[PDB]
Design a protein around this motif. Structure first.
Motif, mmCIF file in Angstrom:
data_model
loop_
_atom_site.group_PDB
_atom_site.id
_atom_site.type_symbol
_atom_site.label_atom_id
_atom_site.label_comp_id
_atom_site.label_asym_id
_atom_site.label_seq_id
_atom_site.Cartn_x
_atom_site.Cartn_y
_atom_site.Cartn_z
ATOM 1 N N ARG G 6 49.251 90.347 31.446
ATOM 2 C CA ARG G 6 50.580 90.531 32.003
ATOM 3 C C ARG G 6 50.716 89.752 33.300
ATOM 4 N N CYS G 7 51.926 89.272 33.564
ATOM 5 C CA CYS G 7 52.234 88.700 34.865
ATOM 6 C C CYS G 7 52.108 89.772 35.939
ATOM 7 N N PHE G 8 51.463 89.418 37.051
ATOM 8 C CA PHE G 8 51.195 90.405 38.092
ATOM 9 C C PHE G 8 52.484 90.957 38.680
ATOM 10 N N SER G 9 53.456 90.086 38.948
ATOM 11 C CA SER G 9 54.624 90.499 39.717
ATOM 12 C C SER G 9 55.555 91.380 38.899
ATOM 13 N N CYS G 10 56.045 90.874 37.772
ATOM 14 C CA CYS G 10 57.035 91.588 36.980
ATOM 15 C C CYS G 10 56.424 92.354 35.819
ATOM 16 N N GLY G 11 55.503 91.751 35.085
ATOM 17 C CA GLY G 11 54.876 92.411 33.965
ATOM 18 C C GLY G 11 55.134 91.780 32.623
ATOM 19 N N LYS G 41 61.014 81.712 32.737
ATOM 20 C CA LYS G 41 62.069 81.355 33.677
ATOM 21 C C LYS G 41 61.671 81.651 35.118
ATOM 22 N N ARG G 42 61.300 82.897 35.394
ATOM 23 C CA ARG G 42 60.953 83.303 36.748
ATOM 24 C C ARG G 42 59.695 82.584 37.212
ATOM 25 N N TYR G 43 59.695 82.134 38.468
ATOM 26 C CA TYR G 43 58.538 81.396 38.958
ATOM 27 C C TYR G 43 57.327 82.294 39.149
ATOM 28 N N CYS G 44 57.536 83.605 39.253
ATOM 29 C CA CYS G 44 56.411 84.530 39.293
ATOM 30 C C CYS G 44 55.591 84.445 38.014
ATOM 31 N N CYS G 45 56.257 84.280 36.870
ATOM 32 C CA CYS G 45 55.543 84.078 35.617
ATOM 33 C C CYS G 45 54.971 82.672 35.524
ATOM 34 N N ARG G 46 55.697 81.681 36.034
ATOM 35 C CA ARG G 46 55.248 80.300 35.908
ATOM 36 C C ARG G 46 53.956 80.066 36.674
HETATM 37 ZN ZN LIG Z 1 56.575 87.464 36.095
#
Ligand SMILES: [Zn+2]
Ligand SMILES: [Mg+2]
Ligand SMILES: [Zn+2]
Lengths: 113, 32, 39, 263, 133, 147, 67, 506, 137, 62, 49
Positions: G6-11, G41-46
């Motif tokens: 999972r992405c740390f920020s959003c999930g 899309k979100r740079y947190c995932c990128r």
């Molecule tokens: Zn994310």
RNA sequence: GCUUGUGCUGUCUUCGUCCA
């Protein structure tokens, strides 16, 4: 090591009441309500619903500490109305609002499915 | 062929609806 | 060695990226230095 | 009085606009969807053999984060509320994974498709790991080389994201209101001009920009809210929205019952 | 009921440092040598230069915890567009007929210069200011 | 990577953190007061450059004594639909209302240091004492006392 | 060590996109275009896919301790 | 090492953290430390029931006990006792119960430079493994939360407990005898938020006012009338701050000869605990003498003064949480109109230094009495360059808007000063090593990139750029030399100062 | 190669651009007007090579107050990462390994030869600078 | 002499259902069991335990 | 390492000298007693054989 | 009736942490 269990945020102990009400004698017709195992989700909803009632003259809440899952709410109504009745009316009104919101969302989703 | 082989006037038709020296393309083995 | 598929793909990507960087960064620096000179 | 208008609809995300509701209600709905909708996730791992290069608790943490289909989780019971000794079929789902590499060359990838549901509640559509398609291999769990084997048995339980983030059905809930700042709820930092230094909101075309001669309206309140609900695949977007509403209703009903029984 | 009443013409409006607060200076039309320096909220009661304002000062709005006003009750504020409540923190018994009254409406300051006869009754702890336009 | 050490003060869940219009919550919030007295402008420049790089899929080149300027990074950031200085309109987690002040927001490289509280906490009521002086021994590992 | 689930920020689940990302990069697509094609899309995932270093390919090169 | 100072029992040590939701004289203690430490309580007929409950709970359940001590002195360990429920307590026995809430404990940080480094707090048991302090007490301890550790000592007697609660208690230590001024004041973001909250154009709606009023522990349940009654009820931040101030406090201050009408909202006037005008900042709620804290301590006493910190902190922290505050790279940038002014000022100063160099090289330079030609030349050049940096910084500071975050932090006094703005925005300035410009380490030059005998400002350590603009390699090296000198000076003077203080105390 | 004693007698150029004779953001080069003409004998390969191993990790070290650079040089030797790839077969007294190392988004050119891309010692966190609840003071 | 000491046990009720542990303290009616899953030790009543034997799991009759 | 020790300390050995340019790191040095005495080679430095 | 298990060096050296 000293970290508490995560289920203590929402699991209520048997000896702890969910909802303790004590009167506030400094001003007339005022009560102090202590909610256990609750947070801003219920508190803000109740507060902003009660703030619109013409017979409620003071409503507020605070979370004493982020590390403890409880909040305390102060409510103070007019002379005619008992505060607990106002709290019950707020709960029922928000329930009806959520019910009609769910119905409308289901209709829209079926239309756009 | 590529974008370079396109005619300069036709390249002018490609308008967004230049590289910068400080944006590298990522690598995995590096060097040394 | 018999390298895995992912490692071979990563090596190819690294070679391509190294070549592209060596071209584009040098081109951008050459473009910038002449402008700084004529100013 | 409340209204809902759907902009885009998908299995994994829905973009909708709420109106004629208070800001508090929309925010409480967002919070409930984020951290109070029950889902199903792996909560115990019994490692019968693990000769891979990853630590046992490394793989356990990775397994806990794998989303599982939680459509019929309402019928399921909480582990602490089930009177059965040990775990029964009505409060847990048992999945089993067995991976091995054959041959003395190459590397084997262990995917979440290898998780096989062994036991669970009767006829309830729960427990299966979420797959994008029928040919989607899923989440990469581990890698193996020759003579390395992974043999584990995992138990999935029902919980909420308050206890651990692995039970969260949503990924990120975009939330937004008042694109043109008519309420003056924010004050815009600027260097020269605040209007041309700030990007327009993606919903700026949905509301009429204020007139140049318009005066400030002190009687206005936020009325229209734009929110996008993205899910991890365990629950559909409509299911997440409806179950968040139902959870909020249950919480309020519990408070009402406590008040009425207090006297 | 009302302790002071007059009509003022705004000479200067100074925004200065702030965005929501303006200093206005006015002189009474019926009687010069009466000055009014005042802080107002721009977003609620915007004013312009050379405007005419009816300013009234009262010690009570009748005809301790504050409550939102019921729509059924009526008070003196029903006739005006901008009502403030403040405390008098200085009553300068100055020269022969130069009297200054300083009032602070929660940090928004007002100074009223005038003769003794006009401002004699303004020796109160708290004052309401009622502005109509 | 700029001498900005600190310790965790509290942990908030996903729904209590402030969020932007597109749903991004920070992993970590640091006080503004860390910057002005210590003058670590490189922290802010690195945050901006990392934001641009992660948006565009590149790796920023932060080599010293180069021709990189803040204005070039700001132009790149503006071209991607973000505020050129890195600010973002951010909402309050508790109530959902907009924050009156926009928030500097972006990714930064953090590193976890070896000093953890559970390796430093120590208490002693009674225990071993030295043979010569009969005073508490020295050391947390030996259940010692404090001087 | 290995791509996070999972992405740390959003999930968002990014653990199933590592192989597709490598395949896209193999075909000559740029990193930004590859990340866009995967619907990140979100740079947190990128940043999760962009800055991941794959160390398990180095741990696997050591001879297994059992057989 | 063994008689003047020795290792002691009944003590704890761990990392400290901050808690805005703690009273001034409260410390947050982890549960494990509370279980480990103990206090022997004598069994009497006022507490025998409670002490029996504690004995039943055992040494693993809080509240609990560790030992029971008989009259003869024998200790009964409750870990290894199989019949703990079969123990009856007689009057005069002692129960070594766990550490509980409101137990006075001595709290200390090293080095203990003055007597405010040891103060007695009241225990509050909390989860997680760090000590927790109200942030106002971080000033006397000289502590911050980047890894500091502090020591806790538990009194073991009624006499010692009374001494700690009556002599070393935190409220009693607010005013110091060193300079007869308070040692604790509002600090950091509470200071910034009380400056922002008390601006003239801060208005608060009814629903937020209700929440802010409920947060004040000492509020009497009466809501003040709003400053603006019509068309919309609005309160100002000064009203909500005056709610936190005890009644009967009078404070008057004149800032820059302001009139009673305070056009710039400076100065101060508090009448009967209600703020009339003036922005509240470091000059009012800081640690300086004659402020609000000193007035309250002299007037109302240590208890009310301690409660004042909590009230102000709670109100301001709620307001700032729901308002927000940040800082970005855009706050260190000045527009082109100011950058050209700064560049012109720096160029003019360099031209002046060049003229001075020519005059000195042609024997036309006046000599300051008592100094040689070289010394006078160096002093004049240093003065010119310092004036250049000050002028450029003043231009940059005058450029900044009111919404600039760095300007807000400097104006509130919470953190930073004018020199920081000057160096981040305008010009780093002249680097001095041992009180002089950069020497000629090489043969008649400072670096191998300069020609011999070069006295230009950039050749001897004048950093023309700013931190935002970036430093050239030579300026980078000179600035590194200056920073190394600073580090060495600190690390050397600390030992000399310690020796001096030890001799003075002896 | 030149040592500390031969450097006394040479004239070095900082960059190859120095070998030949109005923006508010770019930095200002030295004027060097004291000499009518220069005859350089050497040129620096790259000025950023005056830094050590630990100081080559800092991004934009020339935008920082120097004591902060020193503190980071000290603290970078205490960051948990992946010290070696064979940590499984080693028996060290202590060892700390980070689960999910990530390479920095803002890197320096000197990190290529320090292998910081292959054995990184940190993670990219989404950082917000704000006074949120008073718990980060 | 507390035959269940130092024996593998499983929890069948409460907030730790189905977690394997080892009994450490056996004073009476309150057993201290260290958990294999996190690194902590918890008290638990005897009625909540399932003591491992040679034939599956056995309730508190060992 | 510079073996000057602690006894008879002076600031001059600990300082960063002009001639250190390019041969030792200007930024990397320990804290406390050994500040300035412990040096790190620059990234292109060498030692003659 | 088979009955439960209590004890830890010392001296150098180095490298670190927080103030200074
Ligand atoms: Zn994310
Ligand atoms: Mg510190
Ligand atoms: Zn069951």
């Amino acid at each position: 090591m000293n970290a508490p269990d995560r289920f203590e945020l929402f699991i209520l102990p048997d000896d702890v009441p969910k909802l303790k009400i004590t009167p506030d004698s400094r001003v007339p017709n005022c009560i102090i309500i202590k909610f256990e195992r609750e947070d801003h989700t219920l508190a803000n909803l109740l507060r902003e619903e009660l703030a619109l009632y013409p017979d409620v003259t003071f409503v507020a809440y605070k979370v004493e500490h982020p590390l403890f899952a409880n909040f305390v709410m102060r409510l103070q109504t007019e002379e005619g109305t008992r505060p607990k009745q106002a709290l019950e009316r707020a709960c029922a009104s928000i329930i009806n609002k959520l019910k009609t919101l769910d119905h409308k969302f289901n209709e829209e989703w079926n239309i756009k499915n | 062929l590529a974008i370079e082989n396109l005619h300069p006037d036709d390249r002018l038709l490609l308008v967004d609806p230049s590289p910068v020296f400080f944006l590298r393309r990522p690598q995995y083995v590096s060097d040394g | 060695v018999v390298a895995s598929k992912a490692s071979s793909s990563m090596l190819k990507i690294d070679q391509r990226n190294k070549k592209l960087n060596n071209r584009f960064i040098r081109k951008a620096e050459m473009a910038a230095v002449e402008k700084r000179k004529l100013r | 009085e409340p209204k809902v208008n759907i902009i885009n609809a998908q299995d994994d995300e829905v973009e909708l606009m709420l109106s004629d509701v208070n800001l508090s209600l929309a925010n409480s709905l967002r919070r409930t969807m984020l951290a109070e909708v029950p889902t199903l996730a792996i909560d115990l791992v019994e490692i019968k053999m693990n000769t891979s290069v990853l630590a046992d608790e490394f793989i356990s943490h990775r397994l806990g984060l794998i989303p599982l289909v939680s459509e019929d989780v309402e019928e399921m019971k909480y582990s602490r509320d089930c009177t059965c000794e040990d775990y029964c079929d009505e409060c847990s789902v048992v999945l089993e994974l067995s991976a091995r590499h054959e041959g003395e060359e190459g590397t084997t990838d262990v995917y979440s498709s290898s998780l096989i549901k062994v036991s669970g509640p009767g006829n309830l559509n729960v427990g299966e790991p979420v797959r994008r398609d029928d040919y989607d291999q899923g989440i990469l769990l581990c890698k193996l080389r020759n003579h390395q084997e992974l043999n584990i048995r995992c138990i999935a339980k029902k919980g909420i994201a308050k206890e651990h983030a692995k039970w969260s059905p949503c990924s990120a809930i975009a939330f937004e209101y008042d694109p043109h700042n008519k309420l003056k709820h924010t004050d815009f930092w600027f260097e020269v001009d605040a209007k041309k230094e700030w990007p327009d909101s993606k919903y700026a075309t949905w509301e009429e920009p204020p007139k140049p001669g318009e005066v400030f309206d002190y009687k206005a309140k936020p009325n229209r809210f734009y929110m996008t609900v993205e899910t991890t695949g365990s629950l559909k977007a409509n299911q997440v929205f409806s179950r968040g509403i139902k959870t909020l209703q249950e919480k309020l009903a519990n408070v009402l019952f406590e008040l009425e029984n207090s006297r | 009921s009302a302790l002071f009443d007059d009509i003022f013409t705004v000479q200067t409006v100074d925004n200065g440092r702030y965005n929501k607060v303006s200093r206005i200076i006015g002189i009474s039309t019926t009687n010069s040598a009466i000055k009014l320096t005042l802080d107002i909220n721009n977003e609620m009661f915007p004013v312009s230069q050379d405007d005419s304002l009816t300013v009234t000062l009262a010690n009570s709005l009748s005809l301790k915890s504050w409550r939102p006003p019921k729509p059924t009750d009526k008070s003196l504020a029903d006739d005006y567009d901008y009502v403030m409540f403040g405390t008098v923190y200085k009553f300068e018994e100055g020269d022969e007929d130069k009297i200054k009254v300083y009032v602070s409406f929660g940090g928004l300051l007002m100074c009223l210069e005038g003769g003794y006869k006009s401002l004699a009754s303004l020796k109160q702890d708290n004052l309401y200011i009622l502005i109509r336009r | 990577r700029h001498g900005q050490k600190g310790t965790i003060g509290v942990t908030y869940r996903h729904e209590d953190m402030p969020f932007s219009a597109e749903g991004i919550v920070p992993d970590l919030i640091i006080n503004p007061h860390a910057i002005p007295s210590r003058m670590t402008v490189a922290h802010l420049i690195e945050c901006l450059l990392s934001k641009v790089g992660s948006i565009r899929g590149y790796e920023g080149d932060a080599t010293p004594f180069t021709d990189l300027t803040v204005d070039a990074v700001s132009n790149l950031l503006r071209d991607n639909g973000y505020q050129s200085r890195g600010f973002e309109v951010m909402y309050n987690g508790h109530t959902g209302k907009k924050l009156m002040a926009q928030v500097f927001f972006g990714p930064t490289y953090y590193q976890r240091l070896r000093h953890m509280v559970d390796d430093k906490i120590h208490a002693r009521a009674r225990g071993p004492v030295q043979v010569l002086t009969r005073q508490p021994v020295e050391g947390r590992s030996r259940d010692g006392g404090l001087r | 060590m290995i791509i996070p689930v999972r992405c740390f920020s959003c999930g968002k689940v990014v653990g199933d996109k590592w192989d597709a990302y490598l395949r896209l990069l193999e075909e000559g697509k740029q990193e930004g275009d590859a990340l866009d094609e995967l619907k990140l899309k979100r740079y947190c995932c990128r940043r999760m896919v962009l800055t991941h270093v794959d160390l398990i390919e180095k741990f696997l090169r050591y001879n297994p301790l059992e057989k | 090492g063994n008689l003047m100072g020795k290792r002691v029992d009944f003590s704890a040590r761990t990392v400290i953290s901050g808690d805005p939701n703690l009273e001034l004289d409260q410390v947050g203690v982890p549960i494990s430390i509370a279980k480990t430490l103990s206090y022997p309580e004598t069994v009497t007929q006022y507490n025998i029931h409670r002490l029996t409950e504690y004995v039943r709970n055992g040494p693993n359940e809080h509240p609990g006990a560790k030992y029971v001590i008989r009259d003869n002195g024998d200790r009964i360990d409750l870990r290894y006792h199989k019949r703990a429920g079969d123990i009856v307590l007689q009057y005069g026995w002692k129960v070594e119960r766990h550490l509980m809430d409101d137990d006075p404990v001595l709290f200390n940080r090293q080095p203990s430079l003055h007597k405010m480094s040891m103060m007695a707090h009241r225990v509050k048991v909390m989860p997680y493994s760090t000590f927790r302090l109200n942030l106002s007490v971080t000033s006397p301890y000289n502590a911050d939360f980047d890894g500091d550790e502090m020591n806790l000592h538990v009194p073991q007697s009624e006499e010692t407990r009374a001494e700690l609660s009556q002599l070393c208690a935190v409220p009693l230590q607010i005013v110091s005898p060193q300079s007869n001024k308070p040692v604790m004041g509002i600090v950091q973001d509470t200071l910034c938020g009380v400056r922002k909250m008390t601006l003239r154009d801060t208005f608060i709606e009814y629903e937020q006012v209700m929440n802010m009023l409920f947060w004040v522990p000492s509020w009497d349940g009466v809501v003040p009338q709003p400053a603006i009654l019509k068309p919309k009820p609005l309160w100002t931040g000064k009203q909500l701050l005056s709610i936190a101030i005890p009644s009967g406090i009078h404070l008057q201050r004149t800032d820059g000869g302001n009139s009673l009408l305070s056009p710039k909202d400076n100065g101060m006037l508090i009448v009967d605990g209600k703020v009339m005008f003036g922005v509240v900042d470091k000059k009012t709620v800081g640690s300086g003498g004659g402020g609000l804290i000193h007035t309250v301590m002299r007037e109302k006493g240590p208890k009310i003064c301690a409660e004042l910190f909590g009230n102000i902190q709670k109100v301001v922290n709620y307001w700032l949480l729901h308002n927000g505050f940040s800082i970005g790279i855009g706050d260190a940038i000045a527009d082109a109109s100011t950058m050209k002014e700064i560049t012109h000022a720096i160029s003019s100063a360099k031209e002046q230094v060049q003229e001075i160099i020519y005059k000195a090289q042609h024997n036309e330079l006046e000599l300051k009495p008592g100094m040689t030609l070289r010394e006078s030349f160096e002093g004049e050049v240093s003065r010119t360059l310092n004036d250049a940096r000050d002028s450029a910084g003043r231009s940059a500071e005058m450029n900044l808007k009111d919404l600039n975050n760095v300007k807000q932090m400097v104006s509130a006094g919470s953190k930073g000063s004018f020199i920081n703005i000057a160096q981040m925005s305008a010009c780093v300035g002249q680097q001095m090593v041992e009180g002089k410009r950069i020497a000629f380490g090489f043969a008649d030059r400072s670096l191998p990139h300069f020609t011999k005998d070069d006295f230009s400002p950039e050749s001897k350590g004048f950093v023309e750029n700013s931190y935002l603009r970036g430093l050239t390699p030579q300026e980078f090296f000179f600035h590194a030399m200056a920073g190394r000198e600073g580090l060495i000076d600190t690390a050397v003077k600390t030992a000399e100062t310690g020796y001096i203080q030890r001799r003075l105390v002896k | 190669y030149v040592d500390g004693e031969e450097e006394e007698t040479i004239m070095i150029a900082m960059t190859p651009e120095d070998l030949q004779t109005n923006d508010t953001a770019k930095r200002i080069k030295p004027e060097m007007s004291t000499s009518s003409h220069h005859t350089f004998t050497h040129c620096e390969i790259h000025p950023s090579m005056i830094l050590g191993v630990a100081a080559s990790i800092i991004p934009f070290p020339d935008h920082n107050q120097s004591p902060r650079n020193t503190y980071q040089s000290a603290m970078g030797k205490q960051a948990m990462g992946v010290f070696l790839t064979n940590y499984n077969v080693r028996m060290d007294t202590m060892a700390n390994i980070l689960y999910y190392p990530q390479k920095p988004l803002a890197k320096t050119q000197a990190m290529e030869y320090l292998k910081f891309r292959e054995l990184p010692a940190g993670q990219n966190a989404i950082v917000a600078i704000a006074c949120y609840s008073g718990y980060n003071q | 002499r507390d035959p269940t000491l130092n024996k593998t046990v499983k929890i069948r009720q409460g907030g730790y259902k189905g977690k394997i542990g080892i009994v450490k303290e056996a004073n009476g009616d309150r057993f201290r069991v260290e958990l294999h899953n996190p690194n902590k030790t918890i008290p638990i009543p005897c009625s909540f335990l399932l003591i491992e034997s040679t034939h599956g799991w056995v309730p508190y009759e060992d | 390492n510079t073996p000057i020790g602690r006894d008879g300390k002076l600031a001059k050995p600990r300082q960063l000298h002009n001639t250190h340019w390019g041969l030792v790191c200007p930024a990397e040095t320990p804290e406390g007693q050994a500040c300035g005495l412990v040096k790190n080679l620059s990234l292109l430095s060498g030692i003659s054989i």
